[PDB]
Amino acid sequence: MDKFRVYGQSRLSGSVNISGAKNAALPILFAAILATEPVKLTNVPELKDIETTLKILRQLGVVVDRDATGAVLLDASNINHFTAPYELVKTMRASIWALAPLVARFHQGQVSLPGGCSIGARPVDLHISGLEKLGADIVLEEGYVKAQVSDRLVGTRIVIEKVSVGATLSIMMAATLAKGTTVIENAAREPEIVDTADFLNKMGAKITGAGSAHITIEGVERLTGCEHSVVPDRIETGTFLIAAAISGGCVVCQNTKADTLDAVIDKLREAGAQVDVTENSITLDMLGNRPKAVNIRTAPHPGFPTDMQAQFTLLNMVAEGTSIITETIFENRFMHIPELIRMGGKAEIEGNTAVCHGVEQLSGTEVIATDLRASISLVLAGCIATGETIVDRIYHIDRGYEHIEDKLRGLGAKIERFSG
Amino acid sequence: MDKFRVYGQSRLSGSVNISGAKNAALPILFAAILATEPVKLTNVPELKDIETTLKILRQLGVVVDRDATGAVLLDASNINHFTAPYELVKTMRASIWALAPLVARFHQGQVSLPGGCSIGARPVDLHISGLEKLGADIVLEEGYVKAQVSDRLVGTRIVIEKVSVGATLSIMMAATLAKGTTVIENAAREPEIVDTADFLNKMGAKITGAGSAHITIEGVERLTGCEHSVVPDRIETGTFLIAAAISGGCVVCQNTKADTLDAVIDKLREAGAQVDVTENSITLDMLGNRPKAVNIRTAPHPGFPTDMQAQFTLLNMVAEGTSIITETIFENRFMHIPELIRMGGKAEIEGNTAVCHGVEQLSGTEVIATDLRASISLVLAGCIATGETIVDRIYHIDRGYEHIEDKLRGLGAKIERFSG
Numbered sequence: 084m085d086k087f088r089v090y091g092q093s094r095l096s097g098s099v100n101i102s103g104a105k106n107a108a109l110p111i112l113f114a115a116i117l118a119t120e121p122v123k124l125t126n127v128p129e130l131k132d133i134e135t136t137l138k139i140l141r142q143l144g145v146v147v148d149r150d151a152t153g154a155v156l157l158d159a160s161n162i163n164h165f166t167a168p169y170e171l172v173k174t175m176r177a178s179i180w181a182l183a184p185l186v187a188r189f190h191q192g193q194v195s196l197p198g199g200c201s202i203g204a205r206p207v208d209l210h211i212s213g214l215e216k217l218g219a220d221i222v223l224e225e226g227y228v229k230a231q232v233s234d235r236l237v238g239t240r241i242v243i244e245k246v247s248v249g250a251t252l253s254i255m256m257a258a259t260l261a262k263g264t265t266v267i268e269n270a271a272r273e274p275e276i277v278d279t280a281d282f283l284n285k286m287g288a289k290i291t292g293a294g295s296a297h298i299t300i301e302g303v304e305r306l307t308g309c310e311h312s313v314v315p316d317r318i319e320t321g322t323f324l325i326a327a328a329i330s331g332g333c334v335v336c337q338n339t340k341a342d343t344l345d346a347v348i349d350k351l352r353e354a355g356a357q358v359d360v361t362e363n364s365i366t367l368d369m370l371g372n373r374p375k376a377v378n379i380r381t382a383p384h385p386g387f388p389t390d391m392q393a394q395f396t397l398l399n400m401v402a403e404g405t406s407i408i409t410e411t412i413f414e415n416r417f418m419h420i421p422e423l424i425r426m427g428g429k430a431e432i433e434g435n436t437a438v439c440h441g442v443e444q445l446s447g448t449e450v451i452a453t454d455l456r457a458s459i460s461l462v463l464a465g466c467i468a469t470g471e472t473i474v475d476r477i478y479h480i481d482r483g484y485e486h487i488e489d490k491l492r493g494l495g496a497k498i499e500r501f502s503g
Numbered sequence: 504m505d506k507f508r509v510y511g512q513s514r515l516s517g518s519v520n521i522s523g524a525k526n527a528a529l530p531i532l533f534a535a536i537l538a539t540e541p542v543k544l545t546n547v548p549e550l551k552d553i554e555t556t557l558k559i560l561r562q563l564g565v566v567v568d569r570d571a572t573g574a575v576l577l578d579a580s581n582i583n584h585f586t587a588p589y590e591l592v593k594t595m596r597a598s599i600w601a602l603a604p605l606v607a608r609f610h611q612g613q614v615s616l617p618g619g620c621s622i623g624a625r626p627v628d629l630h631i632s633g634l635e636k637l638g639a640d641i642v643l644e645e646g647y648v649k650a651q652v653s654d655r656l657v658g659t660r661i662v663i664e665k666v667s668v669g670a671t672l673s674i675m676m677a678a679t680l681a682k683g684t685t686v687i688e689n690a691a692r693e694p695e696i697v698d699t700a701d702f703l704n705k706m707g708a709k710i711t712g713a714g715s716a717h718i719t720i721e722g723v724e725r726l727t728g729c730e731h732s733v734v735p736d737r738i739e740t741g742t743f744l745i746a747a748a749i750s751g752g753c754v755v756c757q758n759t760k761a762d763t764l765d766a767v768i769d770k771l772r773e774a775g776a777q778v779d780v781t782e783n784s785i786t787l788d789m790l791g792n793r794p795k796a797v798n799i800r801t802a803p804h805p806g807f808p809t810d811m812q813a814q815f816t817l818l819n820m821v822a823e824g825t826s827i828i829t830e831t832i833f834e835n836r837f838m839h840i841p842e843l844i845r846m847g848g849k850a851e852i853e854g855n856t857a858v859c860h861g862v863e864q865l866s867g868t869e870v871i872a873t874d875l876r877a878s879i880s881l882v883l884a885g886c887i888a889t890g891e892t893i894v895d896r897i898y899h900i901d902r903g904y905e906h907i908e909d910k911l912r913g914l915g916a917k918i919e920r921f922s923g
């Protein structure tokens with residue numbers, strides 16, 4: 084079981100290159116099940132979630148591999164299996180995205196129903212419901228969501244009652260091959276949804292409104308292929324900007340997208356940080372100052388992203404003053420708080436809210452990671468805490484961050500991967 | 504990684520012997536740190552939690568082992584180490600109970616601060632707070648809760664603002680050796696607390712009011728030793744009564760305690776079960792009938808116990824009608840719902856409430872265990888579901904149930920433990 088050994092107080096400063104969004108690459112890879120011609124994806128991060136997706140894709144008949152240039156070449160021209168197996172699905176619930184394109188293109192699909200997840204209740208009722216409105220017959224047999232449709236899907240008006248990133252993407256994917264026009268009202272607006280829509284359009288789709296709560300899709304017979312550069316990862320960017328904010332350092336993020344982090348950037352400024360945004364980079368200079376506590380409320384884009392919640396919890400735990408953190412997306416995503424309390428942090432939880440009291444310094448000790456995106460807060464804490472910190476079960480971190488040790492070391496952090 | 508293979512529909516009927524309460528044996532074993540003379544505990548279940556406690560106890564200088572008769576012999580006359588190490592504490596947060604007796608008897612103690620736990624936020628602020636009111640100086644250093652006191656503790660009035668089983672037990676333990684009298688208002692009333700108090704009294708303690716919200720303890724210089732038979736486990740009993748209730752069978756639980764399951768028994772009757780209570784046994788006969796849905800609201804004893812919540816969720820998922828399950832103890836203890844949904848169950852979660860719709864039959868498939876007490880619901884589901892069911896990560900089950908496969912097989916269930 085790999086662990087991270089991170090050392091005493093450090094000023095995190097320097098340059099770091101931002102990779103493509105994990106959550107844009109993932110849905111794009113599943114959407115690729117629709118491509119009848121070669122696909123070439125660039126700027127795809129190198130982390131476990133991508134590898135798992137490739138394993139699922141390959142067992143469907145898709146030929147896909149990353150070459151020496153780092154680009155992902157994919158050929159889905161001969162899919163001959165239409166099931167995403169339980170053995171793989173259980174490791175990454177996002178694989179539910181395989182159902183939509185499979186049934187839209189091949190009129191049948193099967194995916195293991197995602198079970199429980201630590202961070203909260205995550206049913207996929209909205210995905211099923213949306214596909215059913217497009218004309219799909221779906222049943223649950225032996226733990227598998229089985230979808231079938233006698234003819235091409237049929238576009239129609241669809242109002243998702245809850246703001247859902249996943250459901251918005253499943254429905255949109257399926258809608259690209261449906262007969263007529265589909266309209267997704269109350270659609271999630273996340274930047275990854277915009278990128279997937281742009282990807283599909285480059286292959287012949289006709290999607291407009293992506294980024295808004297009103298999506299319009301004019302179905303087509305089939306999609307071809309394309310080359311696509313994945314949109315910069317706003318969460319990785321936010322995470323590194325936070326690295327400087329919590330250490331009083333100065334960090335420059337390269338290859339960023341200016342407008343996908345407004346909520347995060349505003350909070351960093353509210354906390355006392357100076358941030359400079361150029362078309363392709365973002366620089367945060369904490370001017371060697373301690374952060375000022377700021378309240379946080381997670382919500383769908385463009386509001387504050389839940390994937391940046393833990394990162395900001397850490398910022399608040401070392402800031403000056405008291406703050407209120409409210410999580411409205413996943414009601415049980417505070418696992419990092421008690422791990423941070425072990426390091427000297429001060430906070431109290433009540434429902435979906437946490438009230439933190441900032442402290443001057445954290446102290447190193449052993450802590451456990453459990454959330455692929457949120458747990459990064461523990462590694463960051465190790466970088467600014469006194470003495471030594473041991474972050475166990477970092478395999479979670481490897482699912483949501485590429486070359487995390489190299490990128491952090493590049494900012495002055497003393498971190499080494501070991502086992503035993 | 505061990506898993507359970509359980510087979511198709513079965514009527515669970517027969518006799519099963521109930522063991523001592525895991526949660527009475529655990530606090531009693533930590534309370535034993537106070538004993539200056541030999542201790543002999545009988546009716547102690549054989550499950551992982553006991554083994555972990557013994558490992559912690561042994562590294563303190565306590566000589567303790569279960570003999571061939573199954574009895575646990577303990578000698579804490581020569582404790583020479585006063586730290587419960589992170590390596591052990593992280594596997595069972597209940598080890599926090601080691602701090603109270605250590606500081607009360609040796610005036611110093613050290614225990615790793617429990618980190619995060621899947622089922623919910625579980626701080627121990629009340630334990631620390633209570634010990635501090637008794638005269639202990641406590642600090643958090645390098646992830647360890649360090650307690651110290653220059654002289655014997657001093658008894659005083661203590662009002663725990665929240666109903667807490669753990670805090671009620673830490674404070675009571677420490678109070679037995681404090682100077683003067685301690686009064687614990689708003690104390691938790693659980694049967695295991697009554698049993699621990701009876702155990703301590705047999706060693707010279709002077710505790711009255713256990714079982715009520717008002718505990719009175721007259722401190723003494725030192726405690727001696729005794730022989731004690733652990734109180735029957737109400738949760739294991741409830742679990743087996745439920746086995747019959749969900750399968751229309753008839754089960755007889757031997758060596759039970761009549762009055763520790765009133766809430767559970769009433770709900771079973773509300774659900775259509777016939778239950779006969781004798782001084783030493785409880786029999787549930789479902790008369791081969793399907794259960795009638797019943798609402799559930801968890802709360803401190805004598806209300807409905809959270810440790811029986813999943814078990815009843817399963818009962819509701821196969822009952823007739825709709826039900827509302829509200830969890831007020833641990834807000835994130837519904838992990839079993841999505842695993843049960845995979846088996847054909849119907850339910851929707853909203854906050855700390857789950858609304859279930861009973862179905863006629865469940866269907867076998869693979870599911871994952873994650874809660875030492877709650878996950879037993881998944882194994883039970885396997886017993887009544889059609890076809891085959893695979894319950895993975897049963898090591899959790901082994902922490903909270905002794906010889907679970909043997910006891911279930913003894914009721915007609917087809918279950919086998921395997922790996923790979």
Ligand SMILES: CC(=O)N[C@H]1[C@@H](OP(=O)(O)OP(=O)(O)OC[C@H]2O[C@@H](n3ccc(=O)[nH]c3=O)[C@H](O)[C@@H]2O)O[C@H](CO)[C@@H](O)[C@@H]1O
Nearest residue numbers: 106177204205206207208209210246247248249250390412
């Ligand atoms: C692979 C991926 O991109 N994962 C991201 C995606 O997850 P995810 O796909 O789950 O995001 P959703 O926006 O769909 O849903 C968030 C909330 O909606 C609920 N819900 C969702 C679907 C449904 O059918 N029914 C339902 O009740 C969920 O239980 C949860 O409370 O968005 C989250 C919020 O930005 C991120 O933290 C995840 O990292």
Ligand SMILES: CC(=O)N[C@H]1[C@@H](OP(=O)(O)OP(=O)(O)OC[C@H]2O[C@@H](n3ccc(=O)[nH]c3=O)[C@H](O)[C@@H]2O)O[C@H](CO)[C@@H](O)[C@@H]1O
Nearest residue numbers: 526597624625626627628629630666667668669670810832
């Ligand atoms: C070893 C053992 O006996 N474990 C049992 C014990 O756990 P446990 O010792 O945690 O029980 P508690 O009754 O003390 O507490 C339950 C609730 O109180 C909160 N709390 C508790 C202590 C504290 O200092 N601060 C605080 O906020 C917890 O976060 C939780 O929400 O009771 C639970 C409820 O019967 C059972 O499900 C556990 O299996």
